[PDB]
Amino acid sequence: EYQNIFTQVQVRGPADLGMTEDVNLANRSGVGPFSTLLGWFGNAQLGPIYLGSLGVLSLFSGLMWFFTIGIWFWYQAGWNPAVFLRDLFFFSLEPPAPEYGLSFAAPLKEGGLWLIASFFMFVAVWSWWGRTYLRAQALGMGKHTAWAFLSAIWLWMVLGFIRPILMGSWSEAVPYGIFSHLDWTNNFSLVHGNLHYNPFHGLSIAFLYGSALLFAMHGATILAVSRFGGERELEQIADRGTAAERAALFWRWTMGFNATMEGIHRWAIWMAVLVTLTGGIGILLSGTVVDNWYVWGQNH
């Protein structure tokens, strides 16, 4: 039996330059090469991509952030390429020390550079958010993507900006480093009395697990009814076919209730955004309102 995990026969035709709507076609690149590799799993076409002011600003601002962390790592490596590769994951660009508080007067080597990198990252992420909004707007689409993105930004804003400010010190922010930010995550829990007993942290885990639960259900469900064209979900929404009916009935017969072809994607978007929505709340309350989650937990 054929399982539809990889395409059996790839077909290729003239490149698809995409819908026009109100997109400013002056900012669209040409079409890239086709990838037979990607063609086994999904579409083989690469590009075109839209490149406007925000995209340019985001890409540039993002590379500055990357370069700032970079030169610091090279500096920590004494400019030796061998040491750079050896200790790559151990390098870290730390925030200013607690004594500097929320001042930007920290010298470059004592957190000044971390503040510069954070500025570039701040501009790169937010200009990219506006990008996700205007690309949907230019095509007359809803802004579900931009709002779902806000949920991820919410947690990132809490970890490195909002909570440190409320704590009154940039030293509470996360460092830039592979291993260093893992260690930061570890110390954060120990300092605040075990995050396992932070209820918003447990809620965040339920939605992270539930996201893998739901996407495995939904991905498997759509492949099981792809023999009826089930992955063409927009037309199944407008004109229910036997794919949507069998999919719904499998789950009704299994667990007692079911979704629609549209409704399952509201379950999915909320399951996923709730991960970083609850998580950002749990972090924002740690140290600002609750010093010890285990102790706080025993009183409720």
């Binding site: 059996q8 026969v9 035709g13 407008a238 076919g241 379950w267 309350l285 309102v289």
Partner: protein, 240 residues
Amino acid sequence: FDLASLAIYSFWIFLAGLIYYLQTENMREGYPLENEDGTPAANQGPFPLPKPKTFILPHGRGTLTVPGPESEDRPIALARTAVSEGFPHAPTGDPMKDGVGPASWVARRDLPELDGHGHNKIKPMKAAAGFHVSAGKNPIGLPVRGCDLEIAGKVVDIWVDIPEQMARFLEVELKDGSTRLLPMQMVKVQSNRVHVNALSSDLFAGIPTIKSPTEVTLLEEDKICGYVAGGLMYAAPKRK
């Protein structure tokens, strides 16, 4: 009553309302629940039916409002096997021809799905300027073999999803000269043949035909795909 307690209590209240909203949104199709005789069921659950929403379909195809009065818009050749509810309804005739059970199809619009520009989403490759097989085995010319290990025909064309650049059907020529479409997800392309485990060679002619050699409608796709999938259960007796 610290701010943490109020936040977690507030969130659980928000989550209950969210679930109530998500569940009602997922009741825009197939509700209200019916008895096995078609009449409305007395118990409809605790969640109410959502208020209608309207989609404006592109290409002047009209508007869809859900929920709305539901209808199968087709006969169902089944019959109760039990006075009490909860038991199978047995086919009264040929379930593959009558399109019941795993062979079921839905009365979708008798129109082809369109792409963003208003052209047929699915087209035979012989009518798709520029499209070709770019990787894997090209099935055109290969013989098609059924679960009975007998040949039913040979592949003569591939129907392609042009926007997605994806093969969706194999057009197979039967021993009588006519042709049928076979879902791409139900065939197994091999080095020297195409094997269809779902049907026997003498059930290919029963596949619903299309009224145009260069387009397939949503209704036709459902009848074709349902019939083939129905073979797994109903063509099994002669499955070697």
